[PDB]
């Protein structure tokens, strides 16, 4: 019947036309193909049509997204489809969830986590000099650390509190950095930055203590052997450094 290939699929998805996907499920089942197959991924990056959809929004929406996820499910492919990684010059291991978070799409984030997105997928930075030139924007690799570092408390709440699959607040990336180290990494000592970073830091610190009363999140060490406080001191992050100190002092005064 209707025939689908990569340029056709990507045309439909980049325009955001749900009607264009009529016939695709039947096509995939009849020809024994999957949306993760090489023929339906961008050769240069590894993107399936899912990242393509998320990068092509109209008023924040692309109605092919729910349809593609359903098609992936019905072809026994849902997990692989959702979590299929891609790369560019800056990161490898990027997933659809990273895109949905970076584009601030709360609804798509929920949809993807509900249908089995890897809440701990790591977008690892790429470098081209012999010592990491830091050409990429570092946010701690993980979806939770991305949400935190981009000032999205609702997504932070969702990712840690949802009933399907929760991001672990204690998680560490490839540098050994927890979300707290990541917040320190992105701190730049400007007023609005210092304001959201300290608020996010405390929200996560308190939430960790509540869930794991035995556990002090700001005690966990990165691979340099540094706590967030000490990383902050070493890297000149004055505003967050000072806030952690006053908070530590206030916390002892409480008891
Ligand atoms: O400074 P705060 O207190 O952290 O407030 C956040 C700020 O307004 C963000 O710009 C916003 O993201 P949007 O631009 O997408 O609205 C976020 O919404 P969120 O919590 O729903 O992620 C707010 O929480």
Swiss-Prot record:
ATP binds at residues 47, 52, 56, 91-94, 103. A 1,2-diacyl-sn-glycero-3-phospho-(1D-myo-inositol-4,5-bisphosphate) binds at residues 104-106, 151-154, 199. It comes from the Eukaryota. It is found in: Apical cell membrane; Cell junction, Adherens junction. ANK repeats lie at residues 92-121, 139-168, 224-251. Belongs to the transient receptor (TC 1.A.4) family. TrpV subfamily. TRPV4 sub-subfamily. The ANK repeat region mediates interaction with Ca(2+)-calmodulin and ATP binding. The ANK repeat region mediates interaction with phosphatidylinositol-4,5-bisphosphate and related phosphatidylinositides. Non-selective calcium permeant cation channel involved in osmotic sensitivity and mechanosensitivity. Activation by exposure to hypotonicity within the physiological range exhibits an outward rectification. Also activated by phorbol esters. Channel activity seems to be regulated by a calmodulin-dependent mechanism. This is Transient receptor potential cation channel subfamily V member 4. It comes from Gallus gallus. The chain holds residues 133 to 382 of 852 of the full protein.
């Amino acid at each position: 019947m209707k025939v689908f290939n990569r340029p056709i699929l990507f045309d439909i998805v980049s325009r955001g036309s749900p009607d264009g996907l009529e016939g695709l499920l039947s096509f995939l089942l009849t020809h024994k193909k999957r949306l993760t197959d090489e023929e339906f991924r961008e050769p240069s990056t590894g993107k399936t049509c899912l990242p393509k959809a998320l990068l092509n929004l109209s008023a924040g929406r692309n109605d092919t997204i729910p349809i593609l996820l359903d098609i992936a499910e019905k072809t026994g492919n849902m997990r692989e489809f959702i979590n299929s990684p891609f790369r560019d010059v800056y990161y490898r291991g990027q997933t659809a969830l990273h895109i949905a978070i970076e584009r601030r799409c709360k609804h798509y984030v929920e949809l993807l986590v509900e249908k089995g997105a890897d809440v701990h997928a790591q977008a690892r930075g790429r470098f081209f000099q012999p010592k990491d030139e830091g050409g990429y924007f570092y946010f701690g690799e993980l979806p939770l650390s991305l949400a935190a570092c981009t000032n999205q408390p609702h997504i932070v709440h969702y990712l840690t509190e949802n009933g399907h699959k929760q991001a672990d607040l204690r998680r560490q990336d490839s540098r050994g950095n927890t979300v707290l180290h990541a917040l320190v990494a992105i701190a730049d000592n400007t007023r609005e930055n210092t304001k959201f970073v300290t608020k996010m830091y405390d929200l996560l610190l308190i939430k960790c203590a509540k869930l794991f009363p035995d556990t002090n999140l700001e005690a966990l060490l990165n691979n340099d052997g540094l706590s967030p406080l000490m990383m902050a001191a070493k890297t000149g992050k004055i505003g967050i450094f000072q806030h952690i100190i006053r908070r530590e002092i206030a916390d002892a005064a409480a008891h």
